[PDB]
Amino acid sequence: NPKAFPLADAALTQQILDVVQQAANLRQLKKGANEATKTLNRGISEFIIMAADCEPIEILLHLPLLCEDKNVPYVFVPSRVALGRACGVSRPVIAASITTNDASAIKTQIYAVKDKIETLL
Template identity: 40%
Template sequence: DISLVKSEPDDDRPNEHGGQENEMTYEEKLAFASPIAHPMASKKLCKKLIKLVKKSAKHKGYTFGGIKAVRTAIRKGQSGLLILAGDSSPIDNMSFLPGLCEEKDIPYVYIPSRKDLGAALNVRRGVVALLVKEHEDYKSLIDECSQQVRALDIMV
């Protein structure tokens, strides 16, 4: 007699708090971030940034994901808010982006996990760099996030 019922529970089922059982906390993700990932978003700001990315993902042409697309968009004069993943490896691949942003006066911030950034953008892979352009649907949210990012201390 072959039973089709699994005896073990699935690890990827949502827990009672709505998250995944094996999901890491903000502090655990922070441990994997590069030491040069500065300024790092706080836990509260990180949640706002993820919310912003989810809203912007609904509008085609308002997000640029990946190092090459972000670099091209910035050089062509696009503005917005740049969100970088702190756990990107090797970090040297995108270490030029903060300097480029400072030249063009674009606010930028690191979040601890590239997987979170990819999930918010509705892609299966992690995203290491994402430029979010302003749109009227989320203008107040991007302004609030940009203001908080500019308030973070940036060492030049």
């Protein structure tokens, strides 16, 4: 999985997999690659999460190109089955996006995570 880059590290993934969980609870999570593409085009995404273990990996490799075009941070997590479980579904999710909402109750840590991803990038 050399191309999946930057790949979040074992500590980081919890803070990533943590935030996505509440976002699913609060309906601020867009899940699945195609939904992520929508959010970038409309520019309603804080940042986007991808799974490196995907096969064949390229399917999400279009998302980054759209990401730096829009100056949106992005990061890779090792496991897709882990991601979908965090999304709150019975199927593995390869890509997920957090919806923009400055009035959200989970607002602070999302941007705290966003900063860490920005440093990672």
